[PDB]
Amino acid sequence: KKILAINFSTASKKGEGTGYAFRKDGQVYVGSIKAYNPKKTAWERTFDIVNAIKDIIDEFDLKGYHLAIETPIMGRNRKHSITLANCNGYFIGAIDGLVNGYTFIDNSKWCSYHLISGKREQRKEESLELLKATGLVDSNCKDDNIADAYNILTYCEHL
Amino acid sequence: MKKILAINFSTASKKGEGTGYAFRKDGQVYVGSIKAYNPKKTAWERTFDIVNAIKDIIDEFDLKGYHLAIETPIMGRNRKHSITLANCNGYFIGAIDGLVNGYTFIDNSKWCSYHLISGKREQRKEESLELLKATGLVDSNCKDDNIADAYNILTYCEHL
């Protein structure tokens, strides 16, 4: 029930990032770690993303939170998919112990509970629509990493 | 001699298989395998057990600051199996990075090529074990190819 929700990406494309969401003293906090940098490898960007999340964990002194992280999946691009799966694992291994374990949340599953339907690109705008309603972000927000992490948290808080 | 902890990572999905490790300390090579076979556990749960076993080795033998050399995960025939394997390999590395001074991926092809090992998987296991057996660290009857691959990664990395 004390859940740190993560939508993990290594930010291999511009503007991407790892989204996070959690609730502390009833207040929801959300954000993204924007790590795009072609001078760094996926694993180096991952290291930076780990250290950003560790800094939030210490700032908000999250003790006993459980990681809910979106399951890595094989996509069309095989090498991207294996790199992402490996970096997703690095991220989980680096923070497990700061969190009390973790659970894989299947994209299809949180999406179905929130009625997000259609392809990938369209899921992104549906997820953002839900984030926008809560007014934790402004009406201009185009951060689907943030929106996904939020929707994963709400999925988990129900399940 | 650069201080390297060589790992041949496996989730021990098959009985008798496990994660191989090799390191040199005070000139002596130490090798072994973590035999984590347990079909009652998921691959991630066996990986957690292997992480704890390597942390205990790093503690007992005072290896903080050794550099981790680990095989690169590869693309395979079955999507879900290869994604799970790649994720567990990642988990292992992220759990111990910090105890070790960083890590480097070692491609299977590169260490094999250095050691003049060719052929399909089972032949490569045989040739890798021949190199390990020659050191006397295991007996002439050893079939523990996870130990052999860890050893042969260590010696490949020691030449670089």
Numbering used by the authors:
A (entry chain B): 2 to 160
B (entry chain A): 1 to 160
Show me the paper's own sentences about this structure:
The RuvC from Lactococcus lactis phage bIL67 (67RuvC) was confirmed as a functional Holliday junction resolvase in both in vitro and in vivo experiments. However, unlike EcRuvC, it showed a relaxed structure-specificity, binding and cutting fork and X junctions almost equally well. The 67RuvC enzyme has the classical RNase H fold common to many nucleases and integrases including its cellular EcRuvC counterpart which comprises a central 5-stranded mixed β-sheet (β1–β5) flanked on one side by 2 α-helices (αA and αB) and by 3 on the other (αC, αD and αE). A non-crystallographic dimer is clearly observed in the asymmetric unit of the crystal consistent with symmetrical resolution of Holliday junctions in vitro and the previous cellular RuvC structures.
